[PDB]
């Protein structure tokens, strides 16, 4: 239930500064063009609780069974404020299930 593994997740990111989200599709997930990565405040219940999101691009020339490394760039204006709350990256499939949840971080 981590079929998606976020990598190199800092403990904090500078507010309103461009960011890169690194994650790995394990063989156990078949990526879909309506999969997405959200920034979620810690304590989310459902996929509606996202802050902002970006579609996860379909890996080029995908092969079933492969392990695929990905990067999403989050613009500074997609990001929570320096509000003292903790956030995580989450991988949401087109069915709405969360299949990846990173370690928490703060915007500061």
């Amino acid at each position: 239930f981590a079929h998606v593994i976020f990598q190199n997740v800092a403990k904090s990111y500078l507010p309103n500064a461009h960011l890169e989200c690194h994650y790995t599709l394990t063989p156990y997930i078949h990526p879909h063009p309506k999969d997405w990565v959200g920034i979620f405040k810690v304590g989310w219940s459902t996929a509606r609780d996202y802050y902002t999101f970006l579609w996860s691009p379909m890996p080029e020339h995908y092969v079933e069974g492969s392990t695929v490394n990905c990067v999403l760039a989050f613009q500074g204006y997609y990001l929570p404020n320096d509000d003292g709350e903790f956030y995580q990256f989450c991988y949401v499939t087109h069915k709405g299930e969360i299949r990846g949840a990173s370690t928490p971080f703060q915007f500061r």
Binding site: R48, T52, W55, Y78
Partner: protein, 49 residues
């Protein structure tokens, strides 16, 4: 080289424009629904008093 830089900045600008459009569309509609759910939840709390 002027055309190269223009065509690259145009490229990256509109790759970002598409992501922003998808976000604005999701945020717009969901916020609208939240405002109504909030309006109807205060309706239930004040009618429970």
């Amino acid at each position: 080289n002027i055309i190269n830089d223009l065509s690259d900045k145009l490229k990256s600008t509109m790759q970002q424009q598409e992501r922003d459009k998808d976000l604005i569309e999701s945020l717009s509609e969901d916020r609208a629904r939240l405002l109504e759910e909030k309006k109807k939840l205060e309706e239930e709390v004040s009618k429970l008093r």
